[PDB]
């Protein structure tokens, strides 16, 4: 896994092809490493297999990484990183 702090390089946005992408700047030691990601519905219930990107990696300290997700409709929460360093972003996807 990857245990360093993560931060947003560019806020999550919708893509031309019906996904969402967020750029995260890895600020920690131990790269390269797996970016911890987890998508939870409004009930904090892990929404499954909606990370379109191949298992995302941080390349080096202060390396930005594009992550593409297919969030569920309605409210969702994207937890990046692990522990108290973890980022929680909110996303709402409209039906159209």
């Amino acid at each position, epitope marked *: 896994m990857c245990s360093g702090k993560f931060s947003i390089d560019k806020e999550m946005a919708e*893509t031309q092809h019906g996904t969402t992408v967020v750029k995260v700047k890895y600020e920690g030691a131990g790269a390269p490493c797996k970016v911890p990601i987890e998508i939870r519905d409004v009930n904090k219930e892990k929404v499954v297999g909606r990370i379109i990107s191949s298992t995302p990696f941080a390349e080096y300290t202060n390396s930005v990484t594009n992550i593409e997700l297919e969030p569920p409709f309605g409210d969702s929460y994207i937890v990046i990183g692990v522990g108290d360093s973890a980022l929680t972003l909110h996303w709402f996807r409209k039906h159209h």
Partner: antibody
Amino acid sequence: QVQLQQPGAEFVKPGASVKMSCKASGYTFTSYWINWVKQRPGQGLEWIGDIYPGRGTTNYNENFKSKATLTLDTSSSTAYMQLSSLTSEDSAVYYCSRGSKGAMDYWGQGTSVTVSS
Amino acid sequence: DIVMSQSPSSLAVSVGEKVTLSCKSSQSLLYSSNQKNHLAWYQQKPGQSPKLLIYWASTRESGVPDRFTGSGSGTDFTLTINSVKAEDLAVYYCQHFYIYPYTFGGGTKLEIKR
């Protein structure tokens, strides 16, 4: 009808930059994405990046991250791309296209860039 | 990145003859959420900009004659032209939009046989 209008050609020296326009008409400009695509004379197509009119969202191919810049002018319904630190490798035709869900359903005629001293 | 491979690289076909072109993806282009294959075909006539023929693998763009048909799923796609016309000479490309960055196949040069 749907139309994308680009300048025919640009001639510039190495090390310099260039900016080219893509003027849209025939549809509501803020409802569609615009892509940019590179084609070397005898080669295929290469996606540079896209931009969404209105929100201003941009996405780049990592290959062109330090080379290309995508911008807009919503009033003139125009999109622009700038290429920097030019070399002969950048000599190519550059199309803009309208994107419908990832498909490029309309195209400009292309701007042919020659980089030479 | 995703890799789009097209074969043959070139072929010659007569007016009225049928022809099949292939496009394989290095990974699936299928969204299980809506069973949509994120793949498109384009026709680029000599000295002209590319033109969209099909999207989502099987869906014809408006204005395109029905003799152009898209087929396939997952990673194996094909574009068939039956009753090839003389004006159909061009380079046909496939493109994915499964994920950024979009990448195109090497293309297939369609020569006309007279």
